[PDB]
Amino acid sequence: KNLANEVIDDARAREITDGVHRVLDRIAAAEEQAGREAGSVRLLAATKTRDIGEIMAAIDAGVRMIGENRPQEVTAKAEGLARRCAERGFSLGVAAAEHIPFHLIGQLQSNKIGKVLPVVDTIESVDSIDLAEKISRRAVARGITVGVLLEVNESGEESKSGCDPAHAIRIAQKIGTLDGIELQGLMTIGAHVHDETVIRRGFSHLRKTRDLILASGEPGTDRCRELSMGMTGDMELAIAEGSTIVRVGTAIF
Structure with a gap:
């Protein structure tokens, strides 16, 4: 599949538009049920395997944040996506234009x-001090600061991605303390199970x-606010x- 394709048919555009609208409604309904203020939750469209035309249909429908899974897809779509977003009055990843975050998830x-680093403003999959250091060295050398989310394993299965839940704070x-990076919160893939008590426990833990972390007041921790x-x-x-x-x-595409 050519991920650089920029044009989709009318029916496909409609499917994606309805998908985004249904998801936005679900988010609103969920906030209401949880007694949370509207706008408390932001929608990030997971764009893996989708082409530029598909992604832009999602953004045009209301999406204001995207996240790719593979760096190769980031490189394949970055240029076109930035151009298309600019034409639509949005800045994408890395003056009054609204900014659309471009994350690596x-x-x-x-x-x-x-x-x-030349494209994504936030790397949500940092699962270790080791990886964070590697990103830091490269960001510093490039002369920039990249956002990062600490990915925690809340699956209960040691084999899954993410850091040991008990070591997350440390x-x-x-x-x-690392230069070139800004800790903006935590992220988790959760648990791929049908037990809601297990799922809830993991999100609650995150x-x-x-x-x-926010309460610690340690250097570079005051912006650790997101929960992806x-x-x-x-x-x-x-x-x-x-x-x-x-x-x-899936709910979108």
């Missing part, structure tokens, strides 16, 4: 960091962890537990 192989504080959690199948629960960013793919 998939795992980042070390030798691919340089591929995403790792976050260390990340806060929220509490976020709260403790919840996707198509569990966004209602994520929002009930405090999510500030939901990552949606």
